Amino acid sequence: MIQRTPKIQVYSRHPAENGKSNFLNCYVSGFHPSDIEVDLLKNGERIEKVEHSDLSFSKDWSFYLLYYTEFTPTEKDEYACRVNHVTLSQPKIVKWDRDM
Amino acid sequence: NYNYLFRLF
């Protein structure tokens, strides 16, 4: 039984300008098995109409999903990705850093 | 195009 925790990247589709239309992406990759919970959070509360790509995988058989939602960023609005997987005892939260 | 046939292990 292989068990690999997901690599998590939280990023916008386009370079973020406060008050400009954009997409918030949470990319989870390199995990096994495929069962995974992903939420996008606005200020620690859960965003509703979050869409995700169809389950696919890499040459090494590890899975990757993209979770995305339309958003307009502002200075005081902080966004995070929350991930749970069989490899994690407790959900993992990764803050969106518009520089990273 | 998907292939037509799939075999049991």
């Binding site: 990319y27 696919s56 | 799939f6």
Partner: protein, 276 residues
Amino acid sequence: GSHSMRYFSTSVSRPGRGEPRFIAVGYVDDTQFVRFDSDAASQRMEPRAPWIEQEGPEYWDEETGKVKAHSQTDRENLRIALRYYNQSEAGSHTLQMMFGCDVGSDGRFLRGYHQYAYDGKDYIALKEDLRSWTAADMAAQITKRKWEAAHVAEQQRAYLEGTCVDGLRRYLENGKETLQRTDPPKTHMTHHPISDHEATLRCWALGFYPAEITLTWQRDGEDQTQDTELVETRPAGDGTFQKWAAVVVPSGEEQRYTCHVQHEGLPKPLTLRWEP
């Protein structure tokens, strides 16, 4: 240059909470064009690219049939691996499959693939010659002996050299606008002080297709593969890709470091120096 078609299937058992979930997904290069999800309301092979919707209703009927068949088979293959490996009926298990073909600039068949993995490990695979099998362990030997006897290699080789290349060639024509396009990366650099001694130089590449790219750091013109952080290429969500590479530079030596971007879409490799 090569083009490629791949179908990726995942079957996941879940004793007590139904029958196996089966998700299948088709790609031409780095572009998804179809899907099937045994949990999708539709229960059809659905389009995921503009240019596939071009296909007649006879395509969608024949393709839905073939993938539902795959679904039912890999469902039984989860039961068989369970017996071969002597595993409890309590545990959830994964069976993944990958098949497809590559064609050259000319539409000439180049190579083909037919591979299974059970619980994230290689199980059985058609070798490069499309005539023989690699079995990862004793359970797969059993499948190998079965398939050697039933001439399954010859059957698969037929599909890989025929229907698979015929389809890929049809898609590369109908999706020419999209699939034979070359979106070059939009580049920039960022600076992030880590300590009093060191800082991170990050080289960004955004909105590029295909996903194949090389970001390399050079110090005084010599390659700095040691101490380069490279993140997995990631999807923007619009069919283009993003990637970055980083080095921890001794603070006050930023000018000694240049970033090199290589991509199918660039006439020449791009160079970026740190500019305050």
